Amino acid sequence: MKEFYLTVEQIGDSIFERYIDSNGRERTREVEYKPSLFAHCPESQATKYFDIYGKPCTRKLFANMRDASQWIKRMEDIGLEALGMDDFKLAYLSDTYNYEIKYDHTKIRVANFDIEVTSPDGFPEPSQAKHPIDAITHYDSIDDRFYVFDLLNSPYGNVEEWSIEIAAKLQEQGGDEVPSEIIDKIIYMPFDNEKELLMEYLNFWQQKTPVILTGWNVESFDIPYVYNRIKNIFGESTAKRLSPHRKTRVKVIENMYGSREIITLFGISVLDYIDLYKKFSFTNQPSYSLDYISEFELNVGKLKYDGPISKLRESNHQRYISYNIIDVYRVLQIDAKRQFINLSLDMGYYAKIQIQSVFSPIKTWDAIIFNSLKEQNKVIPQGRSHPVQPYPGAFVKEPIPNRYKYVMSFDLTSLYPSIIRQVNISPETIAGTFKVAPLHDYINAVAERPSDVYSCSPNGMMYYKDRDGVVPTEITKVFNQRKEHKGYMLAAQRNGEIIKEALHNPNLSVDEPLDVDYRFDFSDEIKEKIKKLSAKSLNEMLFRAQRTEVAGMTAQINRKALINGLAGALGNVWFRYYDLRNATAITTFGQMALQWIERKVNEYLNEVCGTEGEAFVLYGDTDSIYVSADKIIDKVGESKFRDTNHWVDFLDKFARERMEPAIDRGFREMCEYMNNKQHLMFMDREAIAGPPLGSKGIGGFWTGKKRYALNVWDMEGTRYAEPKLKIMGLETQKSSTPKAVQKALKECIRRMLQEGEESLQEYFKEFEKEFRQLNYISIASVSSANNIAKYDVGGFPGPKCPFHIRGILTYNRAIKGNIDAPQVVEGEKVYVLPLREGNPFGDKCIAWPSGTEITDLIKDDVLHWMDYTVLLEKTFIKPLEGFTSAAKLDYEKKASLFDMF
């Protein structure tokens, strides 16, 4: 089989690499790598190395890696460009793997792990590691085994072995309910003492050394804690065994509130799942406890126990171990759904970087572009330094706040990358400039055609049409992968809607779910086979379909993220190819494109309706238009259609047959006008939106930019079983609005768009009446805890102190003394509650770490002195007023004037 790397590191003048050989065997080697850089030389001097502009370079081989760096320095000490890949790991990878890497994941050792530390001192600090490690569950992807290391004796109690027979049993039967499918995969190891526990774990680490190291919060807690515990006990030399090469960097970086520490383990690629999740999940969560994320992701419960966690090992060691095992499995369950490790392997190898570098779009693209260039014997430029300059981005239309009954939207496919490809924007495709008319002259086709020779952006830049450019070339590739997985995604979604429809005719029948690939539109026979199936079998299929979709979502949205990131990278001063000329060429062309088609789309319909100079496009952001479809519908009359589904099927056909071809012609012209390389501005219909037929519903509304709600029947060719609410920017979407309140505002909106005003009033009446009975956690606000210190000033609110920061201050003050209550972690999320007039906290609000319940030390005073009125007013009524005003409705019954009857 083809060879592939596991990990690479540079230590002094040597490169350390773990890899899989041509026989599937894991090997390590240290290489005295001889790097090669480049300097400009005279035109006459004939070589085969040219920089990106076509200027000739000379290659310089260095005896060791230090020599190469010293030269770079000496060249800056002179003032001449020092060219080539300065990060030697990437050049080594590029040299050692001159082909497209096809890896075998079953050969890659991914370790998933978690530890427990009993601590009656408050949170056990990794930097200090004062308390014993008393459990380690470590899953190995190669062995398919959960390795459990369990301490029975410690300063904080002595405990009987864990029982796997009990662990397996129901909660409802006094067991722990550890899943069947992993019961047989547990390797249990009791330990007399911590010394042996740790000593054994290290020898285990040696024989099954992780390549990919993951888990929950593993980089802020488990890794640092185990490193430091071993360091405190056996010395830093032993602790260094956690690195296959024995080298570790310790980034001290503290804060005002003590000492936090991050350890780098050379030879291992650490991918903390919380960071994977934050980067790839595209959620903004109110809390990042595993319980919370497990629940959100897998719809599994809370992992319940009695008393605090600090007292769990002693009171119930049985459950203490099972819960540690389950925590590890949970991350695995999340990864089987989200596929983030898989994604990271794909990108890492695609680009030829350290896998952990996937967190860096700049590092990722530098390498892709580097390798691409290396293939044509071209030489990359030196990374220079620049001042940060702001630059303009997208255009957003200011909309008329209002209800809108029938709405149809249209969106451009991968716009910024498409613009890159259409215009041919790349560091070496720059041809010159032209003098720019103000933007609106390009929008309305008044300004003279900028060039007859080059491809142009309304920002005044001109690019060669004939050549290629690495950026377009490399961007097009990742785009095509994007399009592939999007395709799989949408079809899985389409299929999922068909299963939903079928769940109205569930057959009284005993069968198994169909063996089908959900990435592809179901065939007629499969469809025919589906109606006759049972509920039990249909639901299994639905679940699978969704699972396919999530998988496809992950692959698609994150390639999109990466390609959009190149476009922004052009405007990050650390990117090798930083260049505001190019970044600005992207954004400005975007602004023109959007407004150009707004002109065209208003023009077309005004002709097609005979009407004169009416507005149809009511909104647009960046690359989207929202078209007011009322006149098209009225041209036929709501009298007809019989059902909702008729007029949707109408509008759809009108979009695909009439609008798009006009839209296409519009973008053809603009491409011509701009004289671009290839037309790639593709705008197809997205959402079809309105109320159920002849209902009291308003269909949709806007409040301003970035804030609207629509009742969507069809989205990108997916016809929903039930109409789905598209809500953008409103409080229902924000992680800072109380859960109960999101839910209720969503129903108010649902009731606004699907049913009428009465329905909405009826609900508002109910909600307010019932509000005081909801759980405190459900009605609490959420916020991040940035810059606590800055505003601290004696433990009381400093100047211009933010509302939430104030609330933490009241917390801290109220938990003074008993270091036992959890401390608000700086930069983490908190619940916030307003405090009622004249309370014992001596301030007007309180905050505490999210996920958690507040410690009982203050819980009951918080519940009593709770300010429901200010909560209701601020978080619910206020935003509702916003929605209904814009919608021209009232949430409360108005004074009839007739009431005197």
Next chain:
DNA sequence: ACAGGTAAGCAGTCCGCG
């Protein structure tokens, strides 16, 4: 340091206001 800009709403502070 190690993708980008655009933009909304909520509070705090300071000022004008018979």
Next chain:
DNA sequence: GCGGACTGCTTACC
């Protein structure tokens, strides 16, 4: 005694 203008902060939308 409070509303408006401005700014800090937070979290959305592309």
